[PDB]
Amino acid sequence: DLGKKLLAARAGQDDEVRILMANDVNAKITPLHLAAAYGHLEIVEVLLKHGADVNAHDWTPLHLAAKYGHLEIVEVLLKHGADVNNAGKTPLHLAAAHGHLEIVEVLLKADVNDKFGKTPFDL
Amino acid sequence: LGKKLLGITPLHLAAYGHLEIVEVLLKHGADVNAGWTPLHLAAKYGHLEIVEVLLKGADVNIDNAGKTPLHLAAAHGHLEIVEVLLKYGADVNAQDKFTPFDLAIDNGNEIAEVLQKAA
Amino acid sequence: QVCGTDMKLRLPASPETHLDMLRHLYQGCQVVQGNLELTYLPTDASLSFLQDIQEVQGYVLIAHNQVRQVPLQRLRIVRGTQLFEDNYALAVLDNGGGLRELQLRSLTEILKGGVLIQRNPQLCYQDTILWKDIFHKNNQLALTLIDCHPCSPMCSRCWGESSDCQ
Amino acid sequence: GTDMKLRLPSPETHLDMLRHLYQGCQVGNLELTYLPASLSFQDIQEVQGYVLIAHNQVRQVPLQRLRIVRGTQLFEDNALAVLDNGGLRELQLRSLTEIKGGVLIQRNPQLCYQDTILWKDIFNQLALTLIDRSCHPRC
């Protein structure tokens, strides 16, 4: 049952994560959702190196990271074929509702035009 | 701690055939006449070296069976213990509830000659 | 009103006087000021004293039990401070007699911690409840890791078999 | 029988295991501890090993059918061990009439009539006999 011990990535125990991968990176929720949400760059990087789903669905890693404010993580997620655009909400929403200028700027090069007809600009 | 050490005292248990054990048990002031006596056991199991050091406050001449160490030593065929128990002054013609002389003759310990001589 | 255990999966040393300790410990208790751990109890155990408990502040733990029912029917909220295995506000393991139902019809709030139900070859309806509705608004990313008659029509998420509904 | 001495178990199956083990036989060492409980499994007649009762809260141990105790295995290199026992009340034995090994009966507050039976006749004339209480009038 190495899967339970893997989702390690939640607490960011990189040595354990690496000692686990060397012995299912797509176990289910995902390890990548976790690492990206809590903000553990090295973890998400090694995970991707092990062939982890970038567009995995719970919610995406990119959306989570765009919500909790993890810039570098977003920059390594979007640079790996991630959907730049749930409850209707896309990353540009979670970012532009939590005051993330850096995130919104970097992600803008994402459409600006929710299920309530709410654009990120209205948030 | 009185249990870890040990009608049985550490002296009876010393009489296992341990010599040094009785040496230091008696050196530490232990009764030697305390219905068997340590001598009854030491003369039965066949431990000569223990009876030797023992007799030097030990009654030589009875129990629930009425047996004297010469009786059981002659019964189990121990010429040494018999000889030295006699030489320490044992009743050659004592009696039990039901004589060491004949007690040997039932076990084919013809010892008996010594008893049939030193009457 | 207030009362616990922090021994985890520690095999009981006393054993022969276990139910008594737990009994005198939890009777009349309405708020458990710590952890509620139920472990290493035979098929004949009573556990009735639990019908008063309506709030645990730490974690919950029901492991190694040949009992079948755990009358935690008053337990409304588990705070979720002291987390079992660092992320489980409720853990139920190795019950199998054997645990058949975790009658927690009053449970509607878990502030912090995930859920862990494993190795229960007799437990039922533990996969009928929507733990995401119980999970607090901020406890969204909690871990849920979960082998029997359908729940009541009047419910259809269910904890028991009677009309025992969520 | 067993040989785990006074080692803890699966407590929730202790009484079960014991049952499934010793019900309907005539033993090996007799070990039964850490029990708070019906022990009507009363079928034991001879035990080749040592008999032990420890850390109990049972008021009776129906071993009345036990008649002989060979002794091959001894508790602490020295046959019958009862200790730290709500609590035992009587051995209920009686059928015993022949015992290698001795007797050690310690720390049983609710036990009685244990120092009424002579043990020399139940025998090993050099076997240890070490038999508290908080009773009603060879029994």
Residue contacts between C and D (CB atoms, under 8 Å): 41
Q: How many CB atoms lie within 10 A of CB B22?
A: 27
Using a CB-CB cut-off of 8 Å, the residues of chain B touching D129 are 8
Residues paired with D82 in a beta bridge: D53, D105
Q: Which CATH number fits domain D1-139: 3.10.129.10, 3.40.50.300, 3.80.20.20, 1.10.940.10?
A: 3.80.20.20
Least CB-CB distance to C87: which of A10, A33, A37?
A10
Name the domain count of chain B: 1
- C-alpha A53: how far from chain center: 10
Method: X-ray
Residue B22: give its domain's CATH number. 1.25.40.20
Say if the Cβ atoms of D126 and B3 lie within 8 Å: no
Task: Give me the residue from C15, C19, C42 closest to D8, CB to CB.
Answer: C15
Distance in angstroms (rounded) separating the CA atoms of residues D108 and D135: 13
| Contact criterion met (CB below 8 Å) for C1 and C30 | yes
- Using CA atoms, how far residue A20 sits from A25, A28, A38, C29, C84, in Å, is 9, 16, 19, 43, 22
Q: Nearest by CB to C141, which of A4, A11, A37?
A: A37
Nearest CA in chain A to C145: A4
Per CB-CB distance under 8 Å, the chain B contacts of D126 are 8, 12-13, 41
CA distances from A94 to A36, A68, A103, A118, D78 (A): 14, 8, 10, 12, 78
Q: CA separation (Å) from C39 to B36, C42, C64, C124, D54?
A: 56, 9, 5, 19, 22
| H/E segment holding residue D35 | none
Q: How far is D15 from chain C (nearest CA, A)?
A: 9
Is C64's Cβ below 8 Å from some Cβ in D?
yes
Q: Report, in angstroms and rounded to the nearest whole number, the Rg of chain D calculated over CA atoms.
A: 14
Q: What is the spatial distance between Cα A8 and Cα A43, in angstroms, rounded to a whole number?
A: 9
For the stretch D52-55, contacts whose Cβ atoms lie closer than 8 Å and that sit 24 or more positions apart, written own/partner, are D52/D6, D52/D81, D52/D82, D53/D81, D53/D82, D53/D83, D53/D85, D53/D88, D54/D6, D54/D81, D54/D82, D54/D83, D54/D84, D54/D85, D55/C15, D55/C16, D55/D6, D55/D84, D55/D85
Contact B37, B58 (CB under 8 A): yes
Comparing CB atoms, the residue among C86, C141, C145 nearest residue A4 is C145
Q: Which one-letter amino acid corresponds to residue B43?
A: A
Q: Among candidates A7, A2, D12, which has minimal Cα distance to C62?
A: D12
For residue C40, the distance in angstroms to the closest alpha carbon of chain A comes to 24
Helix axes B48-55, B19-27, angle to 10 degrees: 20
Q: Which domain holds residue A44?
A: 1-123
Q: State the nearest Cα–Cα gap between C18 and chain D, in angstroms.
A: 9
Give the separation between CA C96 and CA C100, rounded to whole angstroms. Answer: 9
Q: Helix, strand, or coil here: D75?
A: helix
d(CA D8, CA C16): 11
Interface contact flag, D126 B6, Cβ < 8 Å: no
d(CA C108, CA C135): 8
Asked if B6 and D128 come within 8 Å (Cβ–Cβ), the reply is yes
The structural architecture, per CATH, of the domain C1-166 is Alpha-Beta Horseshoe (3.80)
What DSSP string describes chain A?
-HHHHH--TTTT-HHHHHHHHT--TT----HHHHHHHHT-HHHHHHHHHTT--SS-----HHHHHHHHT-HHHHHHHGGGT------S--HHHHHTTTT-HHHHHHHH------TTS--GGG-
User: Which residues of chain B approach chain D closer than 8 Å at the C-beta?
Assistant: 3, 6, 8, 12-13, 36, 41
Q: Which residue type, as a one-letter code, is found at position C6? A: D
Domain boundaries, chain C: 1-166
The Cα-based distances of D95 to A118, B30, D64, D89 in angstroms read: 90, 39, 6, 17
- C50 secondary structure, DSSP code: G
The token pair that represents A114 in the structure block? 């929710």
Question: Which residue in chain C is spatially nearest to D33 when comparing CA positions?
Answer: C16
How close B113 comes to chain D (CA, Å)? 31
Interface residue D4 vs chain C (CB under 8 A):
no
Residues in D closer than 8 angstroms to B6, CB to CB, are 128
C55-56 and C77-78 beta bridge pairing: parallel
Tokens of B50: 């223990």
**Residue C52 DSSP symbol:** G
Q: How far is D77 from chain B (nearest CA, A)?
A: 12
Q: Is C36 helix (H, G, I), strand (E, B) or coil?
A: strand
Subunit contact A10:C143, Cβ cutoff 8 A: yes
Q: Six-digit token pair at C58?
A: 């730490």
